[PDB]
Amino acid sequence: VVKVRPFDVALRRFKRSCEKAGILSEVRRREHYEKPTTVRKRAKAAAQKRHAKKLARENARLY
Amino acid sequence: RKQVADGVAHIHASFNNTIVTITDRQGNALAWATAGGSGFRGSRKSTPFAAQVAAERCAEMAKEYGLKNLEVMVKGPGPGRESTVRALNAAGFRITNIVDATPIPHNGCRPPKKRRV
RNA sequence: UGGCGAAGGCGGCCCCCUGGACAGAUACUGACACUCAGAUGCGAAAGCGUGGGGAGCAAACAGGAUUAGAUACCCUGGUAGUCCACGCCGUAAACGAUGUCUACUUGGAGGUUGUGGCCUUGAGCCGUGGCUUUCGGAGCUAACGCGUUAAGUAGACCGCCUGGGGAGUACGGUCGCAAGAUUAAAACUCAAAUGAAUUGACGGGGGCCCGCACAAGCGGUGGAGCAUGUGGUUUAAUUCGAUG
Numbered sequence: 004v005v006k007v008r009p010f011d012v013a014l015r016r017f018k019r020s021c022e023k024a025g026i027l028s029e030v031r032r033r034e035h036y037e038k039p040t041t042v043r044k045r046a047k048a049a050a051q052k053r054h055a056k057k058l059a060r061e062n063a064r065l066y
Numbered sequence: 067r068k069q070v071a072d073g074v075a076h077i078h079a080s081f082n083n084t085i086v087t088i089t090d091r092q093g094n095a096l097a098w099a100t101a102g103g104s105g106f107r108g109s110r111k112s113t114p115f116a117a118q119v120a121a122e123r124c125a126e127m128a129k130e131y132g133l134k135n136l137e138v139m140v141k142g143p144g145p146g147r148e149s150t151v152r153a154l155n156a157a158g159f160r161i162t163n164i165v166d167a168t169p170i171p172h173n174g175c176r177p178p179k180k181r182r183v
Numbered sequence: 184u185g186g187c188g189a190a191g192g193c194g195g196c197c198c199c200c201u202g203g204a205c206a207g208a209u210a211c212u213g214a215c216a217c218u219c220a221g222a223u224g225c226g227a228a229a230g231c232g233u234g235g236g237g238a239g240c241a242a243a244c245a246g247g248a249u250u251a252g253a254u255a256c257c258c259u260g261g262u263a264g265u266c267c268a269c270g271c272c273g274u275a276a277a278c279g280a281u282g283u284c285u286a287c288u289u290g291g292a293g294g295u296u297g298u299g300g301c302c303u304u305g306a307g308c309c310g311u312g313g314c315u316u317u318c319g320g321a322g323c324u325a326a327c328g329c330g331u332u333a334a335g336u337a338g339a340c341c342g343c344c345u346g347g348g349g350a351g352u353a354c355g356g357u358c359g360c361a362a363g364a365u366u367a368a369a370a371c372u373c374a375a376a377u378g379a380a381u382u383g384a385c386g387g388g389g390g391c392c393c394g395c396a397c398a399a400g401c402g403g404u405g406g407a408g409c410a411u412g413u414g415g416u417u418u419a420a421u422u423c424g425a426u427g
Binding site: 036046047049050051053054058 | 184240292316317318
């Protein structure tokens with residue numbers, strides 16, 4: 004929700020007011036049924052990648 | 067025609083088409099226009115620009131009722147979200163409020179199966 | 184990569200009934216323990232019975248596309264099923280592919296849930312428990328890796344393996360309404376089957392780059408008549424070779 008208080012701002016403010024309610028995110032989640040197993044598999048690989056990043060990104064000479 | 071000045075634009079941006087239904091504030095329809103009735107078909111319906119035209123076509127049919135101020139209720143994930151709203155500003159209409167009206171179930175019905183395309 | 188549960192599993196909020204875990208403190212019992220053949224119970228989803236319910240989804244099925252075909256993938260529909268009650272079934276990559284119990288053996292970083300102290304002198308800091316995640320040391324391992332939550336060092340007990348196919352099949356028994364489960368061969372056949380890792384090649388995997396590779400242009404070929412070569416055919420012979 005954005006009360007137009009110029010329009011160009013208001014539509015950008017709108018576009019960021021709906022990012023933040025994860026609206027488009029949510030529609031794309033609920034377009035097709037994610038089977039619960041697949042949901043978890045994604046979530047593990049997410050966590051696993053996130054860690055395996057940070058770990059080696061603390062191990063982060065080059066030249 | 068009952069002349070109305072304050073109204074509501076309901077943008078329905080599917081991934082396929084985009085519909086624009088300009089109503090009074092009581093949600094009685096006055097005008098409607100659709101990307102896939104405003105010329106474009108198949109691929110090109112699902113573009114911002116087709117939806118823009120829908121909005122334009124609807125706008126210049128909403129002036130019969132003499133509308134001036136609209137609130138924009140943008141409902142869905144489609145390409146014709148932003149473009150329709152621009153096409154209402156750049157068609158005179160003062161936009162008061164830009165609501166998102168996308169239906170979000172609070173876990174509800176099992177969506178259709180995934181496309182093994 | 185929060186929590187709880189033996190595992191399966193468990194997600195709005197409220198109440199009622201109820202199991203387990205954990206911590207602190209004091210008191211108690213006095214080895215009452217550990218493991219378990221057989222046995223018993225629990226056990227995802229699908230399925231089965233009876234009776235309900237049936238929004239959404241969707242085996243089957245129908246139609247539409249795609250295609251050489253398309254009994255598929257895609258689209259439009261759609262029934263059983265999915266949900267409830269009460270039974271049945273007893274199986275899953277039921278997985279950590281890792282039996283249970285016990286003790287011992289360097290560390291680092293986290294999460295979570297108790298407890299004590301300090302000055303809460305200011306959200307904190309320091310102890311002390313439970314559970315959990317990750318990285319690694321020794322050691323172990325074919326390697327990959329495991330690494331105090333061991334795949335290390337030992338002990339108790341149980342389960343199980345003994346080349347690949349045949350075959351988790353046949354027959355018999357048991358169990359089941361059925362589906363089928365469970366127990367479980369042999370003939371015959373092969374000289375392998377297999378694990379991990381290595382180097383390549385390949386991928387309608389990823390990233391990054393180059394060439395008149397494409398794009399941008401310009402002029403051609405393909406069409407005509409001739410020239411020339413090849414094939415084919417013809418010929419007594421149309422010598423032989425060169426063939427993306």
